[PDB]
Amino acid sequence: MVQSSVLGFPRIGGQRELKKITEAYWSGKATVEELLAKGKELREHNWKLQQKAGVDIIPSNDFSYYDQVLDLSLLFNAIPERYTKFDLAPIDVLFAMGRGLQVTALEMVKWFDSNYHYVRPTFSHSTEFKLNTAAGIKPVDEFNEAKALGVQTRPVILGPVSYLYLGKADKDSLDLEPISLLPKILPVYKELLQKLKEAGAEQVQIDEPVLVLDLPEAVQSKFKEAYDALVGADVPELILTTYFGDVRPNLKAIENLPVAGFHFDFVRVPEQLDEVASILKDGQTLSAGVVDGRNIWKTDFAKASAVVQKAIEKVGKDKVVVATSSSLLHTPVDLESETKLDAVIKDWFSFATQKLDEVVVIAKNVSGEDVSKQLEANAASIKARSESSITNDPKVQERLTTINEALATRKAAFPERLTEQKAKYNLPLFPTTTIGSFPQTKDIRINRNKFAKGQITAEEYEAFINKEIETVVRFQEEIGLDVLVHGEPERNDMVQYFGEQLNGFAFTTNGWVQSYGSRYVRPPIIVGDVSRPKAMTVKESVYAQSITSKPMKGMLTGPVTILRWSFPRDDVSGKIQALQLGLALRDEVNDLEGAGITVIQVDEPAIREGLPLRAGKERSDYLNWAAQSFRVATSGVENSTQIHSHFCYSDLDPNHIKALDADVVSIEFSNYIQEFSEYPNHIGLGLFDIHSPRIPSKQEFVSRIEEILKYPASKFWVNPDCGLKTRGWPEVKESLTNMVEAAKEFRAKY
Ligand SMILES: CN1c2c(nc(N)[nH]c2=O)NC[C@@H]1CNc1ccc(C(=O)N[C@@H](CCC(=O)O)C(=O)O)cc1
Numbered sequence: 001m002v003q004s005s006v007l008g009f010p011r012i013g014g015q016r017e018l019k020k021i022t023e024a025y026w027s028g029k030a031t032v033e034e035l036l037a038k039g040k041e042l043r044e045h046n047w048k049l050q051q052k053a054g055v056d057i058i059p060s061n062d063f064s065y066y067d068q069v070l071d072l073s074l075l076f077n078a079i080p081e082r083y084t085k086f087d088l089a090p091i092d093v094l095f096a097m098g099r100g101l102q103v104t105a106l107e108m109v110k111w112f113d114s115n116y117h118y119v120r121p122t123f124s125h126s127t128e129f130k131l132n133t134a135a136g137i138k139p140v141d142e143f144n145e146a147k148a149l150g151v152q153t154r155p156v157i158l159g160p161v162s163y164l165y166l167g168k169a170d171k172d173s174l175d176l177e178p179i180s181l182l183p184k185i186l187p188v189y190k191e192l193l194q195k196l197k198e199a200g201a202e203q204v205q206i207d208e209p210v211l212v213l214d215l216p217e218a219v220q221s222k223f224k225e226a227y228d229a230l231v232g233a234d235v236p237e238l239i240l241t242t243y244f245g246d247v248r249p250n251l252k253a254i255e256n257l258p259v260a261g262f263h264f265d266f267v268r269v270p271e272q273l274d275e276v277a278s279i280l281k282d283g284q285t286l287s288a289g290v291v292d293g294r295n296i297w298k299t300d301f302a303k304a305s306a307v308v309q310k311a312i313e314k315v316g317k318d319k320v321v322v323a324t325s326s327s328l329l330h331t332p333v334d335l336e337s338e339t340k341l342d343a344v345i346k347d348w349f350s351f352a353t354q355k356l357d358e359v360v361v362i363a364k365n366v367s368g369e370d371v372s373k374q375l376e377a378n379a380a381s382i383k384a385r386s387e388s389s390i391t392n393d394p395k396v397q398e399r400l401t402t403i404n405e406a407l408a409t410r411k412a413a414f415p416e417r418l419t420e421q422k423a424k425y426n427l428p429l430f431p432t433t434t435i436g437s438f439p440q441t442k443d444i445r446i447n448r449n450k451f452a453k454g455q456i457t458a459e460e461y462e463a464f465i466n467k468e469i470e471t472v473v474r475f476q477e478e479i480g481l482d483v484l485v486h487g488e489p490e491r492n493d494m495v496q497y498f499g500e501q502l503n504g505f506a507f508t509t510n511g512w513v514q515s516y517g518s519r520y521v522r523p524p525i526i527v528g529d530v531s532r533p534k535a536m537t538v539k540e541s542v543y544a545q546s547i548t549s550k551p552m553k554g555m556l557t558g559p560v561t562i563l564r565w566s567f568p569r570d571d572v573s574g575k576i577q578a579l580q581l582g583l584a585l586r587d588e589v590n591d592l593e594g595a596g597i598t599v600i601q602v603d604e605p606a607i608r609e610g611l612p613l614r615a616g617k618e619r620s621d622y623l624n625w626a627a628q629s630f631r632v633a634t635s636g637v638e639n640s641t642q643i644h645s646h647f648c649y650s651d652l653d654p655n656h657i658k659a660l661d662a663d664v665v666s667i668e669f670s671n672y673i674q675e676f677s678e679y680p681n682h683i684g685l686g687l688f689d690i691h692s693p694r695i696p697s698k699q700e701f702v703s704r705i706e707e708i709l710k711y712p713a714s715k716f717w718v719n720p721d722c723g724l725k726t727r728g729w730p731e732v733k734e735s736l737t738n739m740v741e742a743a744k745e746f747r748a749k750y
Pocket residue numbers: 115492493494495515518519520521565
């Protein structure tokens with residue numbers, strides 16, 4: 001009979017219990033031991049959930065108070081000195097490294113192309129790798145905890161190659177190649193596996209996801225070295241686990257490994273099956289990832305089963321395992337918590353708890369068990385979705401056909417646009433602006449709330465918001481910034497604010513996923529053809545513009561970001577989703593401009609995140625369609641309308657930037673500048689860091705603009721890295737005057 005397997009379970013709790021206890025711990029409200037007690041409770045409950053569902057292979061060590069990579073960093077001693085001389089207990093060294101100390105946290109990084117973030121493994125020349133008993137041995141201890149409940153588990157750890165390859169050298173050891181520490185770390189993994197074996201762990205899931213990445217040959221040889229060194233009689237069997245993409249270009253690196261088996265992701269790349277199956281040795285098992293670990297759609301049991309059967313056919317039923325494609329970390333906990341969803345819609349979904357039942361049902365179906373009831377219920381749910389008008393919008397379909405060159409091209413090229421814009425706005429050289437969001441007051445939320453419970457009227461809350469915009473615009477004026485923003489006080493998440501106002505979307509009350517730390521998101525879901533029925537942002541920008549003579553930036557989140565930070569449709573391409581969004585946002589841009597908001601900025605903070613993980617056709621089509629969707633949203637406007645675009649990734653492919661043809665591009669950027677020397681359009685290389693205090697001076701700033709001018713001055717805007725939502729009013733006062741005053745100097749040197 002075919003076994004079922006789960007690669008990881010989200011640990012936040014059905015009621016966000018993990019957030020509340022960890023936050024209460026950090027803020028003094030809860031003891032360390034009450035923190036450990038909620039932990040056990042969460043693990044117990046999640047193990048029990050999986051046992052009761054009937055999952056055969058059940059993970060342990062997937063739990064974490066913060067980040068699983070960090071947990072491994074704590075466990076192997078990759079713990080820089082600075083964190084060590086504050087007498088912090090190791091759990092508190094944990095929290096120091098992740099979320100800093102009144103010392104900066106270690107770097108947060110995007111975990112592949114998910115919207116989960118991990119803590120960078122950081123390594124020095126001095127780093128000595130060892131297990132530490134007295135800190136407890138997390139994977140061993142949690143494996144023992146589950147065994148005592150009568151639940152045998154499979155520890156999950158990130159393998160050595162991936163762990164090293166994703167870490168970076170610390171400041172003090174700049175010249176180090178992390179890959180090179182491989183001899184130094186294998187012994188420690190060995191010893192950990194020895195101790196997991198002693199405890200009674202028979203199998204271990206060893207994550208090597210960097211196999212789905214373009215790897216240098218020199219890095220590929222390291223799998224044979226690493227795994228030759230780990231496998232043995234004194235250790236558990238190893239299931240080398242990959243997810244999120246296609247391992248075929250690295251197939252040679254793993255075709256003669258002494259591991260007991262492999263896992264691959266056949267949701268994201270079903271087509272790799274045949275090749276990866278072909279290299280299985282006698283005895284090695286194949287874990288077939290066929291229940292999506294990253295999206296929330298009810299699995300098609302017939303198609304998933306046919307994927308598993310294709311593997312059975314190549315390899316034999318006793319050597320295949322039905323699996324989630326990745327850890328379920330990236331999905332919400334429990335659909336049954338959703339109180340507001342239409343039952344028709346809810347019938348399309350499965351969250352992490354429902355996905356447990358899916359891998360069990362799928363395993364049974366391919367085992368030969370009659371599960372024809374479930375298959376029929378499932379087939380009925382799938383058939384209903386693919387017919388619903390909630391997904392069939394004939395107007396949007398027709399509008400898609402109208403997409404062409406003209407529709408993604410401005411009426412004139414930038415040099416001609418600049419003339420009409422200099423006349424219309426007559427901005428001074430070194431124009432000063434900001435990215436959109438400012439610090440926010442307590443009256444805000446209470447006012448939002450009162451209007452939500454019906455306490456104040458729409459024509460009470462609308463005035464509370466305009467006063468807050470008025471406060472924000474008045475401040476900028478006296479400060480003397482040239483192009484202004486409204487502060488975004490009417491706004492929640494920069495995506496949900498748009499999703500709620502767009503057809504084709506649904507929202508959850510409890511669909512929470514961990515983004516980083518104790519900090520969670522509740523992404524919108526795209527269920528169908530998207531359109532914009534009416535004005536989303538116009539009223540607030542029209543009000544801010546009516547109160548001042550200065551040009552007011554309207555403010556949009558771009559189509560790629562709305563797509564990437566939502567759960568997408570899996571029955572249509574990302575691309576098609578992005579272009580529907582481009583067209584809906586086009587209507588918004590047009591209404592904005594129509595209302596006299598003729599400066600408009602578009603934020604695409606998720607452009608890099610959606611980048612296909614391998615270079616190739618998929619990567620360059622993405623850049624073409626990512627750019628194309630942006631241009632479809634912004635190209636209907638007059639030559640005197642000024643289009644801005646903001647980015648948070650500093651290493652953003654210059655050519656993608658040029659491909660947008662924004663009048664102005666603002667980019668986080670505290671050489672490369674030269675790529676734009678002969679590109680006409682204007683650019684504000686973000687001159688300073690939005691994520692900390694320390695208000696820089698005239699010459700802090702000043703040195704910058706000369707150092708950047710070492711790029712022509714006719715094209716330079718002065719602005720920070722991002723919005724200031726994450727800061728306070730005092731530190732914002734000076735920064736911005738110091739910023740402006742700095743600009744005024746150059747400006748008044750011509
Ligand atoms: C700008 N970022 C961002 C994103 N993804 C989304 N969807 N939204 C974002 O703002 N990815 C990159 C980064 C992630 N950072 C964050 C930062 C804060 C919160 C946050 O404010 N979380 C709150 C609840 C949010 C709410 O109530 O709407 C929390 O306390 O968990 C989420 C993600």
